[PDB]
Amino acid sequence: GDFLVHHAIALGLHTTTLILVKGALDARGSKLMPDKKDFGYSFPCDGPGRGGTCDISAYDAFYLAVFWMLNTIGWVTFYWHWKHLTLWQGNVAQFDESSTYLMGWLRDYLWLNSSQLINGYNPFGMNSLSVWAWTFLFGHLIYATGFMFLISWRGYWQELIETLVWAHEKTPLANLVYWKDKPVALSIVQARLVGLAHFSVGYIFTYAAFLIASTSGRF
Amino acid sequence: ATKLFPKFSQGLAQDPTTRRIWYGLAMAHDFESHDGMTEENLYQKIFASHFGQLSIIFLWTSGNLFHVAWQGNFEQWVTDPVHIRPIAHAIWDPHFGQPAVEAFTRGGASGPVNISTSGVYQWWYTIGMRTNQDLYVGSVFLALVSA
Amino acid sequence: EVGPKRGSLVKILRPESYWFNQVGKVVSVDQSGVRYPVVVRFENQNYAGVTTNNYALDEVVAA
Amino acid sequence: KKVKIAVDRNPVETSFEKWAKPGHFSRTLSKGPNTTTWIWNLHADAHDFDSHTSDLEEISRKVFSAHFGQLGIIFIWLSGMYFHGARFSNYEAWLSDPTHIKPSAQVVWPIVGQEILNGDVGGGFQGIQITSGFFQLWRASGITSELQLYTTAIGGLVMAAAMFFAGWFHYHKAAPKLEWFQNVESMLNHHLGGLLGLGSLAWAGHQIHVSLPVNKLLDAGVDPKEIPLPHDLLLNRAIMADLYPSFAKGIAPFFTLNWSEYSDFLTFKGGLNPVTGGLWLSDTAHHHVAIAVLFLVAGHMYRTNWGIGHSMKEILEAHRGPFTGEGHVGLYEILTTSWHAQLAINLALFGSLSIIVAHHMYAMPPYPYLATDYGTQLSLFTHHTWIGGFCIVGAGAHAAIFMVRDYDPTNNYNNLLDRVIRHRDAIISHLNWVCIFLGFHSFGLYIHNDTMSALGRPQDMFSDTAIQLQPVFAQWIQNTHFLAPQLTAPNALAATSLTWGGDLVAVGGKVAMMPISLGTSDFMVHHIHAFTIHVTVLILLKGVLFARSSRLIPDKANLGFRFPCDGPGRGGTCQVSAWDHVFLGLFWMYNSLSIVIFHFSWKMQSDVWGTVTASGVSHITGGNFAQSANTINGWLRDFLWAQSSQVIQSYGSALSAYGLIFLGAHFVWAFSLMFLFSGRGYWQELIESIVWAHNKLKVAPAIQPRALSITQGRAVGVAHYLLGGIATTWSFFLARIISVG
Amino acid sequence: MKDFTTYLSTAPVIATIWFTFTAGLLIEINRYFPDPLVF
Amino acid sequence: WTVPTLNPDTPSPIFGGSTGGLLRKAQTEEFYVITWEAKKEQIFEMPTGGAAIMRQGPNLLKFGKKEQCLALTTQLRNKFKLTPCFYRVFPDGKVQYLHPADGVYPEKVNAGRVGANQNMRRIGQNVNPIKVKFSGRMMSPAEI
Amino acid sequence: DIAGLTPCSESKAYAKLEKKELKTLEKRLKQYEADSAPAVALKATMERTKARFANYAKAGLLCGNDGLPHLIADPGLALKYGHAGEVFIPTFGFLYVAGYIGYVGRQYLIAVKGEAKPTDKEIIIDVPLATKLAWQGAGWPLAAVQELQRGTLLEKEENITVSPR
Amino acid sequence: QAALYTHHQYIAGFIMCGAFAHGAIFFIRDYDPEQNKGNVLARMLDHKEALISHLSWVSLFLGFHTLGLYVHN
Amino acid sequence: GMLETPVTSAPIVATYLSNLPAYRTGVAPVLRGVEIGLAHGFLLAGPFIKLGPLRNVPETAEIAGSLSAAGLVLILALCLSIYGSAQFQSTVARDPLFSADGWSEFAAGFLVGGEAGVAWAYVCTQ
Amino acid sequence: AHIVKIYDTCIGCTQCVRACPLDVLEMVPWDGCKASQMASAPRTEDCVGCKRCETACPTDFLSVRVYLGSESTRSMGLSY
Amino acid sequence: PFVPPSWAPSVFVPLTGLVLPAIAMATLFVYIEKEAP
């Protein structure tokens, strides 16, 4: 099980290095964009021409690499937490026998250690572990919110904002209060950053809450 | 018209949309991209930023020391570091009802407190801290160093 | 008469070109004083779906 | 003005010459491949018939042949189900014990250890427990042997060959003209009278002559081998007269307007059969008779070749008020010339009817021993709901396609459609506001409940004990339906369904159907459903109304229906096409229907399904829906964490495959995030590096490898997301409902 | 027949026949040699 | 050739009105006015949604941005073969002629025009960003 | 023995695991008759289980504390303690088949590259040429080594497209 | 132990991504090919296709084998 | 040009909108703010009094509700003041309300009227 | 405003001007190509950055380039 | 000593949560919308 998870760790490290190294070497230009060095480090794209140039800047390579970094650290922290949990519980054979198949990781580690966490508050009352349950759901909500900025893109939002602008401008008792800044949709780069920030915050808070709650309740 | 914010980018200041605020907030530390930036001024701005970051780090450390000396149980944790849980700081939340108050009241405290997981208790106990007076003196010294 | 012969194969030396270090067939060479008189047609298209381009006299090498 | 059979002889020659030429349908793909993108295009424009040519007649003929090929595929599928039920099933054993033997119709070969999936389903058989409900349907029709199912499979194969021959004949031997396809009046008259009315009448005849006596004898305790054959019942009047005295009078009471004599097989019993748990087949037969008469009457409404009847254009033009301008002028020409508009209308009504079918089938089980099979009930409701949602999204997509391609402003000056386009901004703004209002008042209640429960304040929550929000309208409607057979339904014996109220019906120790009570949790989840439906409608309607133009891009119609963007200009115009709106509507439909099926599963397993004990009924989860469904933590712990124990420990048993799929589905879904969170520029540069590696070893293909297009990347991402999520929920529901149901 | 053979020579038909042959060979190998874990 | 003068007393196409019309920007910042000559009455598509009927002779319309006016110009030129022209109107009453700039459409070459923002080199001949660093503001290597 | 593991022929957990599998199979078999299809299928599965366990113990595999076999990936340990059949011989077998498929595909690409329309030969497979190359690929390591020695395996730097740096 | 190890590992991952991001920023903003002519830095961009290709091969091999062994188990 | 509808062009609703304090166009902004604040405080005291955390304990539910309403009124007054500060910086008849001094007087009147409305709503239940 | 530049590789095919949706590009006389015309950008203050001109350019590499600059009302294409 | 009073959290928590953020938000909002001369 340790051998297999170490190979998974090596996979995560090599893929993250691949994305980062490729983005750093292709930052000055490639065959698709021979003049990428003249556009700066961060820019939206080169337009829909030449088949499409979405996520062509080096900033976008870093952006895609953050997900792989979070996934790699997630694997290493999952391995550390499970091995030490089985060691502290006095049964290392459980980890040695269930760390070779993913069902063991999903049931014996993620499902078995979250029983006390999600029981922090229920209709029968609550205990000191309710804050970690709230943090768990908080991180899940932030992660899912990041998925919105990650999947849905600018155009739809800008058109919706234009409709809202018309609605506010044609509403009595409310058009007297006008904005000082014209409301516009978030930019592509800003959208990627916002989605990445929500993804990372939800990821970190969810794992920290689960880790502390499971380790504190078990011991 | 042109707004005062941001002061480091006249192009962003002339932006009449909400993009101006977001971009001004996200490009404040990009010293090389400001208006009228030279090499000497760039290095000086980074020097000041380094000092400000050091002050923030030291003030945060002093805050941790102060809260452990005030609401923590370091004087009692050192006598029994196996069966006593460390206390981070107290909790003052008006939203808590009666069950939350008695649920968070643990670790030998008199009110709702947070049990620390940072491990500063073991580190401070190992380096020599024994009484809360030591933590208070360390917090005052680190706050003055940050200033 | 200046430039490569019509119908021959030349290599592209322009670094920013999609067909850099690639072979292409010569179509026509302009007889004026234009900067890029050589016309080169390639079997493989670029990302924009174009197979012909105009290159300078020193931008193409016989190969 | 004359309705006739117009046709062309031998328009296309039957040959294999075009089979060897890929992409011959389009002028752009007829050149051949040069890049890998072309290959994807070859599959993306395959069925895009209005893009190959602009001739409406060619498009209509291709549509007709495509319909025949589709029906041939469906007949092959049905014949396969009947053949599997006739040779690899335990239907004969299940007929002798429909309350203990689990239905099964699939066997696996003893290879690589998969024989463990051949679980002991009962009746001396080893297979995979099916949830399609074919056993109950065959029992309802009177099928009592494998020979009948085998004969039905052979008939289905013959029908499939006939459908394929019909498609080939109508495309290469006798192709109808465009005027034949535009006879919507005659088409509607035939589909109303002939198809629906004659089909309902034929099924009523089969139910009266086969389903009713065979099922009556099955419910009377007669062994399936001793029951007379259907032709035996159809040949003599003695057996039918013994089972139903009205048959001793022949068809004489029908022609003498003495239909009351047939009150033994045509009634209003209502409720459910206490022996089987399903609806009374006498009521279904009477239902089909009434439905057949109604559809046959409706089939003589439009004029075809005689003076009597209606003209739909006349009715449409006669409907015009002061607040709508001209009215429905030009709508008839729109629907008689655009296949996409008709597809949008048909897909919307078809999906809505599919969801209605799911609700009516769990509430009023029509097949015998169907309600007691919780697996079949849950799977059928979930399946029909998903099909309805997908069809609705497709309806919105085709509405946008019609608005982009077939719309013409020269024939829509001051009609309803033009006015809708004129005030589309007001429509979208109000729908956006109602979506925000519903989202706040629907999600804030759950968040507030989670906060109050976590803060140790259960008295400040939104529950039955605390502040209650009772659905008084639904409860009053339930009471009215329960009291209907005494005042407003004097000729009805019982109510339409048991969910309204009254006594519960249980068969074989399992609750077939009991009354359903709605509380605060039901109110909250119903508002959640309304909010999700409103948001999906907002995305689809925004993509339909703003398909031609918008305040951001005034010439969107020139860019087509499916295009990635208009560049990074104007701050960014990513996903402005109507196709992207359909792409986002797919995600919202998935979210909405997932919450719908979760609510259905929890409510059924908590307050309806369960065993029957001595002086009390115990449910599967113990009735925790009225106390734990008002919080997100309750849904995550009691419904997702607790109910997923069966799918995670299924390893080593006959349900282990489900667990494997439960893991596999988590992969595909996450795989979707690779195509949804990234862009093709990075992949194109990575492909360039890989191409360099190939060029070094002289292994570079002639077809230049190009990354997936932006639209293709979005389609791949949404497809994988939907497949992963739907398969995850499918494995969880099936494993759980099979283990504890 | 030339057009039919050319159609059968396309990438999806060839891929289907080849994968069916390879899958059948692997399945028959595991059938006549059950549970091979080592050489 | 002479610059046309805007005629405010010009008939407009018969349109029932829509919600995609002008906003507060037309009264606070600027707006655009498109005028054209139609040989006969014809139903056309409005760039902001809806179908209007262009009258015979002069026709005037108001739009919020220049893109709407040029989109309608392209639609009228490619579908009905007309010659439209538009201006930018300010709240103080100033009218500025925009397209066509010289009376001749920009697709065809016309005498008197002077090329601007043209680099007498190629993309591959641009300088490195390190050479344009530490400037007055963010400057791209192609701006010089 | 190696890494504190014991052979599967002398491991108690291995025998207990075999008894557990046979016990659950026999328990499932007790609910059926003797001359029925499910009983024959269960008996066949039990015989397959017995043969699998006997073959694994006969092969000399090393089991752990969980009763499951372990593979030896070190070439020295595998060739020194009789474990070359786990990871060594299958490694060379995959190398032969992998290079076999790669060489066949490379030969087909280079052969169709000099034709008039190589893209047609790529979407529509030339079955006779592909079959001939598939049968001729048995000498792939020899042909690949001879190609590497002649310098014709790789392409020169000047004939490959690169980025503008 | 659990919280400290996880905290430091996530911080290290973010810091590593930042190191590579700043390297890309160096290539776009501060790299000078004329001053770095023939050194190790220019040779990195000289054979960048080989580096990205070999990294792709390693990642592909590791992913296929680890996922295959896990699914097989 | 624009779209006309009976909802936005009925004379009765137009006269109703003209009779509102916001559309007087000729009165002092202090009177408008006082009227708006009173009408808002009277309705604002409701939700806090009948739904706050201390709604079940007697003799203090009205106290807590009125205090929360006054706090919300104060927050709204601060928002109105900063809105007039950041909105008017330079430059029928021009309404004096849409000016820096006019909006400041309007915000002060809104605060006064809001506190009076909260106090009047509390004594109305006593 | 965005920066629109025309390079000497322009063949004067006039496709970039027709693809421009806000009338930014035009054709001026020249002596570097057979068509004796060259694209020009004298109204960059109205350019939004849709890059339709870059898509319509057939030269390798492109002759017209768009660089996103300071955003304004005309550059963001706002009708409000 | 440096020990704060018993009532210190009851005054510093509402301060840091409602007084300081409101003043900071209002000041920053006014500063962002300041028009240049």
**Rounded Cα–Cα distance for residues F142 and A27 (Å):** 17
Alpha carbon of D117 to those of D655, E26, E27: distances in Å?
Answer: 7, 21, 18
User: Would you tell me the crossing angle of helices D281-298 and D212-219 to the nearest 10 degrees?
Assistant: 160
**Rounded Cα–Cα distance for residues K10 and K7 (Å):** 5
Please say whether the beta carbons of D342 and D335 come within 8 A. yes
**Contacting residues for D122 by C-beta, under 8 A, at least 6 apart:** D90, D93, D94, D97, D100, D101, D102
Phi/psi of residue F14, nearest 5 degrees: -75, 110
Phi/psi of residue I120, nearest 5 degrees: -70, -35
| D211, HSE (Cβ side, Cα atoms, 13 Å) | 26
Using a CB-CB distance cutoff of 8 angstroms, which residues of chain J are in contact with residue C19?
60
User: Would you tell me the crossing angle of helices B132-146 and B39-70 to the nearest 10 degrees?
Assistant: 160
Instruction: Work out the angle at residue A135's Cα, subtended by the Cα atoms of residues A129 and A137, and round it to the nearest 5 degrees.
Output: 110
DSSP state of J75: T
Alpha carbon of E13 to those of C10, C40, D212, E20: distances in Å?
Answer: 39, 38, 50, 11
Which residue in B has a C-alpha nearest to residue J70's C-alpha?
B11
Please say whether the beta carbons of J9 and C36 come within 8 A. yes
Instruction: Work out the angle at residue B123's Cα, subtended by the Cα atoms of residues B118 and B125, and round it to the nearest 5 degrees.
Output: 125
Nearest Cα neighbor of H7 from A76, C63, G54, D187 is A76
**Rounded Cα–Cα distance for residues D447 and D453 (Å):** 10
**Rounded Cα–Cα distance for residues A208 and A107 (Å):** 19
- The backbone region for D622, taken as left when phi is positive above 0, alpha when psi lies in -120 to 50, beta otherwise, is left
Q: Cα D708 to chain center, whole Å?
A: 31
Tell me if F19 and D551 make a contact (CB, 8 A cut-off). no
SS3 category, D708? coil
Question: Does residue H66 sit at the D interface (CB-CB below 8 Å)?
Answer: no
Nearest Cα neighbor of G78 from G95, G94, G59 is G59
Please say whether the beta carbons of D420 and D545 come within 8 A. yes
D283 sits in which H/E element: helix D281-298
Give the determination technique. cryo-EM
Q: Is I61 among the annotated ligand-binding positions?
A: no
SS3 category, G62? strand
Breaks (C-N over 2.5 A) in chain B follow: none
Phi/psi of residue D694, nearest 5 degrees: -70, -45
Q: Cα G65 to chain center, whole Å?
A: 26
How many structural domains does chain G have? 1
Size of interface B-F (CB pairs under 8 A): 15
SS3 category, F98? strand
Which alpha helices (DSSP H) does A36-105 contain, by range? Answer: 58-88, 92-98, 102-104
Using a CB-CB distance cutoff of 8 angstroms, which residues of chain A are in contact with residue J3?
none
| H17, HSE (Cβ side, Cα atoms, 13 Å) | 25
- The backbone region for D382, taken as left when phi is positive above 0, alpha when psi lies in -120 to 50, beta otherwise, is alpha
**Rounded Cα–Cα distance for residues F88 and F68 (Å):** 12
Nearest Cα neighbor of B114 from B87, B96, B95, B94 is B87
Tracing tokens 């133009």 back to the chain, one arrives at: D549
Please say whether the beta carbons of D728 and D666 come within 8 A. yes
Residue positions counted in chain E:
39
Breaks (C-N over 2.5 A) in chain K follow: none
Tell me if A182 and J54 make a contact (CB, 8 A cut-off). no
The nearest CA of chain G is from the CA of H37 a distance in Å of 12
**Rounded Cα–Cα distance for residues I70 and K4 (Å):** 31
Tracing tokens 């042949």 back to the chain, one arrives at: D65
- Which of B17, B19, B100 faces D455 most closely, judged by CB atoms? B100
Neighbours of chain G (3+ CB pairs under 8 A): A, C, D, E, H
Question: Does residue G155 sit at the C interface (CB-CB below 8 Å)?
Answer: no
| G 27-46 → H contacts, CB under 8 A | none
Phi/psi of residue G143, nearest 5 degrees: -65, -40
**Rounded Cα–Cα distance for residues B110 and B76 (Å):** 14
Question: Does residue B122 sit at the H interface (CB-CB below 8 Å)?
Answer: no
CATH number of the structural domain spanning residue G162: 1.10.8.110
**Rounded Cα–Cα distance for residues B42 and B48 (Å):** 10
Using a CB-CB distance cutoff of 8 angstroms, which residues of chain F are in contact with residue A37?
128-129, 141
Strand partners, F61: F34
For chain J, the domains span: 1-80
Tell me if A38 and F138 make a contact (CB, 8 A cut-off). no
Which residue in B has a C-alpha nearest to residue K7's C-alpha?
B92
Please say whether the beta carbons of F87 and F6 come within 8 A. yes
Range of the domain at C35: 1-63
Q: Is A153 among the annotated ligand-binding positions?
A: no
Contact flag for E and H (3+ C-beta pairs < 8 Å): no
SS3 category, D504? coil
Using a CB-CB distance cutoff of 8 angstroms, which residues of chain H are in contact with residue B119?
3-4
**Contacting residues for A179 by C-beta, under 8 A, at least 6 apart:** none
Phi/psi of residue J70, nearest 5 degrees: -70, 130
Nearest Cα neighbor of D735 from D131, D137, D135, D132 is D131
CB atoms within 10 A of CB A142: 19
DSSP string, A192-211: HHHHHHHHHHHHHHHHHHHH
Q: Is I119 among the annotated ligand-binding positions?
A: no
How many structural domains does chain C have? 1
- Which of A31, A35, A51 faces C18 most closely, judged by CB atoms? A31
Tracing tokens 């066509």 back to the chain, one arrives at: F100
Tell me if K34 and I78 make a contact (CB, 8 A cut-off). no
Question: Resolution of the deposited coordinates, in angstroms?
Answer: 17.1
SS3 category, F21? coil
Please say whether the beta carbons of D485 and D433 come within 8 A. no
Which residue in H has a C-alpha nearest to residue G162's C-alpha?
H49
**Contacting residues for B115 by C-beta, under 8 A, at least 6 apart:** A128, A216, B85, B86, B87, B88, B106, B107
Range of the domain at G62: 1-165
Phi/psi of residue J60, nearest 5 degrees: -125, 105
Nearest Cα neighbor of K1 from F143, C40, B70 is B70
Please say whether the beta carbons of A184 and F37 come within 8 A. no
- Which of I20, I83, I86 faces A173 most closely, judged by CB atoms? I20
Strand partners, D613: D616
Q: Is J57 among the annotated ligand-binding positions?
A: yes
**What residue ranges define each of the domains in chain I, with the CATH number in brackets?**
11-124 (1.20.1240.10)
Size of interface B-H (CB pairs under 8 A): 6
CB atoms within 10 A of CB D608: 25
The nearest CA of chain D is from the CA of E10 a distance in Å of 8
Instruction: Work out the angle at residue I41's Cα, subtended by the Cα atoms of residues I40 and I47, and round it to the nearest 5 degrees.
Output: 100
The nearest CA of chain A is from the CA of D643 a distance in Å of 12
**Rounded Cα–Cα distance for residues D94 and A72 (Å):** 52
Please say whether the beta carbons of D20 and D26 come within 8 A. no
Nearest Cα neighbor of F46 from D350, A181, D548, C13 is D548
SS3 category, D93? helix
E-assigned strand segments in A81-196 = 121-122, 125-126
- Which of A26, A53, A155 faces D575 most closely, judged by CB atoms? A155
Q: Which tokens hold the place of F26?
A: 């037309």
CB atoms within 10 A of CB D167: 19
Spatial strand order of the sheet with D510-513 comes to: D505-507, D510-513, D610-613, D616-619
J65 sits in which H/E element: strand J64-67
Cα radius of gyration (chain E): 15
Strand partners, G63: G6, G69
User: What are the counts of helices (DSSP H) followed by strands (DSSP E) for chain G?
Assistant: 7, 3
Please say whether the beta carbons of I51 and D469 come within 8 A. no
Peptide bond between residue D16 and the one before it cis (omega within 30 degrees of 0): no
User: What are the counts of helices (DSSP H) followed by strands (DSSP E) for chain K?
Assistant: 2, 0
DSSP string, D320-364: --TTSTTBSTTHHHHHTT-HHHHHHHHHHHHHHHHHHHHHHHHHS
Please say whether the beta carbons of I4 and F24 come within 8 A. no
CB atoms within 10 A of CB C58: 9
Question: Does residue A71 sit at the H interface (CB-CB below 8 Å)?
Answer: no
- The backbone region for A63, taken as left when phi is positive above 0, alpha when psi lies in -120 to 50, beta otherwise, is alpha
**Contacting residues for D281 by C-beta, under 8 A, at least 6 apart:** D140, D207, D211, D212, D215, D216
Nearest Cα neighbor of D621 from D611, D606, D642 is D606
Alpha carbon of I51 to those of B72, D336, D440, I57: distances in Å?
Answer: 37, 58, 17, 12
Residues of J with a Cβ under 8 Å from any F Cβ are: 3-9, 12, 14, 17-18, 21-23, 25-30, 36-44, 46, 48, 61-62, 65, 67, 73-74, 77-80
**Rounded Cα–Cα distance for residues A188 and A57 (Å):** 12
Q: Which tokens hold the place of A209?
A: 């809450």
Tell me if D692 and G153 make a contact (CB, 8 A cut-off). no
Cα radius of gyration (chain J): 13
**Rounded Cα–Cα distance for residues B71 and A77 (Å):** 31
Tell me if I3 and F19 make a contact (CB, 8 A cut-off). yes
**Rounded Cα–Cα distance for residues F18 and D403 (Å):** 18
**Rounded Cα–Cα distance for residues D242 and D235 (Å):** 14
Which residue in D has a C-alpha nearest to residue H48's C-alpha?
D689
DSSP string, E20-35: HHHHHHHHHHHHHS-S
Nearest Cα neighbor of A35 from D248, D305, F124, J12 is F124
Using a CB-CB distance cutoff of 8 angstroms, which residues of chain D are in contact with residue F47?
549, 554-555
Tell me if C15 and A31 make a contact (CB, 8 A cut-off). no
Q: Which tokens hold the place of B113?
A: 């407190």
**Rounded Cα–Cα distance for residues F95 and F115 (Å):** 25
User: Would you tell me the crossing angle of helices A2-25 and A58-88 to the nearest 10 degrees?
Assistant: 160
